[PDB]
Amino acid sequence: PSVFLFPPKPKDTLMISRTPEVTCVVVDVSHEDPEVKFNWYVDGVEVHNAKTKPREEQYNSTYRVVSVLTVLHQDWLNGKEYKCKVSNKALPAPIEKTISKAKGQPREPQVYTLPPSRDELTKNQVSLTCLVKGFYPSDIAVEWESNGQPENNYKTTPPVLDSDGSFFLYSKLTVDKSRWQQGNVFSCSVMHEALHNHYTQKSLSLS
Amino acid sequence: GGPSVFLFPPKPKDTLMISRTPEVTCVVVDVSHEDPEVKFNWYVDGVEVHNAKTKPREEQYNSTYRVVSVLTVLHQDWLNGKEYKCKVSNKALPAPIEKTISKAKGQPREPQVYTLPPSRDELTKNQVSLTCLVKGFYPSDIAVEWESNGQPENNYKTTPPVLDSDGSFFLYSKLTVDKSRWQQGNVFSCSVMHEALHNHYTQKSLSL
Ligand SMILES: *[C@@H]1O[C@H](CO[C@@H]2O[C@@H](C)[C@@H](O)[C@@H](O)[C@@H]2O)[C@@H](O[C@@H]2O[C@H](CO)[C@@H](O[C@@H]3O[C@H](CO[C@H]4O[C@H](CO)[C@@H](O)[C@H](O)[C@@H]4O[C@@H]4O[C@H](CO)[C@@H](O)[C@H](O)[C@H]4NC(C)=O)[C@@H](O)[C@H](O[C@H]4O[C@H](CO)[C@@H](O)[C@H](O)[C@@H]4O[C@@H]4O[C@H](CO)[C@@H](O)[C@H](O)[C@H]4NC(C)=O)[C@@H]3O)[C@H](O)[C@H]2NC(C)=O)[C@H](O)[C@H]1NC(C)=O
Numbered sequence: 001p002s003v004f005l006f007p008p009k010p011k012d013t014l015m016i017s018r019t020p021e022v023t024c025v026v027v028d029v030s031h032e033d034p035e036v037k038f039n040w041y042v043d044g045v046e047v048h049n050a051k052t053k054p055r056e057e058q059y060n061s062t063y064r065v066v067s068v069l070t071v072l073h074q075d076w077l078n079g080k081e082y083k084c085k086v087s088n089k090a091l092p093a094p095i096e097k098t099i100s101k102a103k104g105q106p107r108e109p110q111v112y113t114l115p116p117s118r119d120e121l122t123k124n125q126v127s128l129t130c131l132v133k134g135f136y137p138s139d140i141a142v143e144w145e146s147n148g149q150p151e152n153n154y155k156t157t158p159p160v161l162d163s164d165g166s167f168f169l170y171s172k173l174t175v176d177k178s179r180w181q182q183g184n185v186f187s188c189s190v191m192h193e194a195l196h197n198h199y200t201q202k203s204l205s206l207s
Numbered sequence: 208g209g210p211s212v213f214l215f216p217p218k219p220k221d222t223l224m225i226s227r228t229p230e231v232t233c234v235v236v237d238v239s240h241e242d243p244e245v246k247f248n249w250y251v252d253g254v255e256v257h258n259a260k261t262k263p264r265e266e267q268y269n270s271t272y273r274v275v276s277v278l279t280v281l282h283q284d285w286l287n288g289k290e291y292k293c294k295v296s297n298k299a300l301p302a303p304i305e306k307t308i309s310k311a312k313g314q315p316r317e318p319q320v321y322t323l324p325p326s327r328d329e330l331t332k333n334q335v336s337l338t339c340l341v342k343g344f345y346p347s348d349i350a351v352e353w354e355s356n357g358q359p360e361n362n363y364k365t366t367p368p369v370l371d372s373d374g375s376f377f378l379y380s381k382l383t384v385d386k387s388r389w390q391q392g393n394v395f396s397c398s399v400m401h402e403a404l405h406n407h408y409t410q411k412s413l414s415l
């Protein structure tokens with residue numbers, strides 16, 4: 001069997017109303033010796049407020065078991081390490097893995113929206129672009145909207161490391177050209193720790 | 208935990224330009240001293256082939272052997288979706304390991320290439336962002352380069368291909384230039400290479 005430790009989702013750590021969670025995911029657990037334990041430490045100290053989830057069988061004979069610790073927003077955002085221990089009869093010894101947020105001074109994203117290229121405007125569907133650059137660390141969340149209604153048809157590139165050590169990404173929202181034509185306003189929402197109130201938005205309209 | 212095998216495909220650019228030499232590479236690692244002998248077999252669509260070039264093994268600093276075999280592939284063969292199988296045998300193995308690689312299956316689709324000038328809010332800053340949007344391509348193997356006046360740029364970074372809901376791929380490439388150049392009115396050029404482009408090339412320019 002193996003181990004894989006994972007961080008909160010960015011959106012989760014940035015809005016106080018949401019519940020950010022770290023999660024140990026153990027793979028290639030077998031029927032024989034099926035009992036898997038966990039233990040959790042935050043900055044090494046044992047913490048007890050965690051919750052192992054009930055298990056699941058995989059096709060390939062082997063299980064996929066998963067524990068979950070809830071986390072404080074400021075704790076994660078201040079670099080505390082989240083260590084997860086895992087035990088099992090088919091071990092050499094107790095596995096262990098660790099995670100924490102990237103080190104470094106947070107850097108604020110600059111957010112630009114770009115209209116469709118002339119060349120694409122004539123087509124049935126046009127592409128609205130949102131360029132987010134200069135941000136550190138790479139934990140970020142992007143969303144689109146019009147009229148305070150969530151647009152659903154957009155995709156966002158992963159963050160890419162730029163030449164100066166910050167990250168950028170693009171988000172592409174595709175809309176039927178008419179909406180673009182009618183003059184509707186579209187907005188790109190960006191969530192990031194270095195932003196005032198973890199959040200900014202930029203609008204895109206036909207001029 | 209015996210030998211492990213990794214099979215790497217050609218670089219996209221190499222399969223698209225007849226001048227270059229696309230290769231598939233079968234890398235074996237963690238080969239022991241106990242059994243250091245390694246045998247490669249190569250198959251192109253199930254049919255065994257014999258022109259592969261296998262380098263002599265190399266001890267790594269962790270006292271395991273690394274062995275590499277290189278199969279030169281024909282461009283039209285890779286682009287016609289032939290499958291390349293590497294087969295690795297070692298006396299430490301319960302059975303031989305086999306890995307297979309090919310161009311991703313599906314129908315190719317031509318990229319649409321679009322260049323976007325700097326946002327107004329950014330035309331101010333000392334340095335400015337030229338964007339090349341490449342959309343609607345399949346499969347995701349692609350190459351993007353920026354040029355001005357025949358010379359390559361360098362200050363550019365490109366996203367990985369992203370899956371776009373209609374099944375095709377898109378990506379953005381970002382060229383960064385000093386504000387002066389952009390206002391001085393130099394044409395900057397975004398080259399794309401892809402199997403589904405005529406001549407496997409297109410190029411769009413960007414200026415003020
Ligand atoms: C003893 O030492 C050797 C040598 O190691 C080297 O030196 C030591 C001292 C250390 O410093 C090492 O860090 C250093 O690498 C060890 O050999 C290594 O063995 C590991 C596995 O244990 C290999 O990992 C794999 O790497 C490939 C990527 O490999 C390219 O990139 C590396 C740099 O990032 C580079 O070093 C490699 O040489 C290689 O470079 C490429 O070479 C080709 C051929 O020449 C060339 O054309 C390319 O241009 C070039 N690319 C460059 C420069 O970037 C990685 O892809 C593998 O990931 C797959 O498999 C994993 C399983 O191990 C899995 O977790 C991953 O998710 C991934 O899974 C696969 O993913 C594909 C698609 O993503 C998917 O289709 C499959 O489903 C899936 N396959 C599965 C599940 O198997 C993997 O991480 C190292 O490459 C290798 N190093 C070298 C130089 O060969 C050895 O392990 C040591 N042993 C010990 C500790 O005892």
Ligand SMILES: *[C@H]1O[C@H](CO[C@@H]2O[C@@H](C)[C@@H](O)[C@@H](O)[C@@H]2O)[C@@H](O[C@@H]2O[C@H](CO)[C@@H](O[C@@H]3O[C@H](CO[C@H]4O[C@H](CO)[C@@H](O)[C@H](O)[C@@H]4O[C@@H]4O[C@H](CO)[C@@H](O)[C@H](O)[C@H]4NC(C)=O)[C@@H](O)[C@H](O[C@H]4O[C@H](CO)[C@@H](O)[C@H](O)[C@@H]4O[C@@H]4O[C@H](CO)[C@@H](O)[C@H](O)[C@H]4NC(C)=O)[C@@H]3O)[C@H](O)[C@H]2NC(C)=O)[C@H](O)[C@H]1NC(C)=O
Nearest residue numbers: 002004006007009023025027028058059060061062064066
């Ligand atoms: C039999 O099947 C099982 C189950 O597989 C599944 O079912 C079968 C039947 C098939 O259909 C499969 O295709 C199918 O997926 C296999 O179990 C898989 O086992 C592998 C290990 O062999 C595990 O590998 C790893 O995956 C993680 C990422 O997994 C997160 O992302 C996955 C997609 O990428 C996703 O599937 C997971 O669910 C999980 O996702 C997330 O879930 C969390 C928690 O719920 C959630 O909060 C997240 O939001 C969500 N994320 C997303 C995107 O949805 C990957 O991280 C592991 O990677 C590293 O490890 C490699 C070595 O294992 C190494 O080569 C890589 O380079 C990389 O190494 C790390 O690199 C970083 C940076 O460079 C470095 O900092 C780290 O130190 C380094 N790590 C270290 C220390 O090694 C790894 O690839 C799969 O998770 C697991 N799949 C599932 C679904 O459980 C099993 O292997 C099969 N068995 C056999 C014999 O074949």
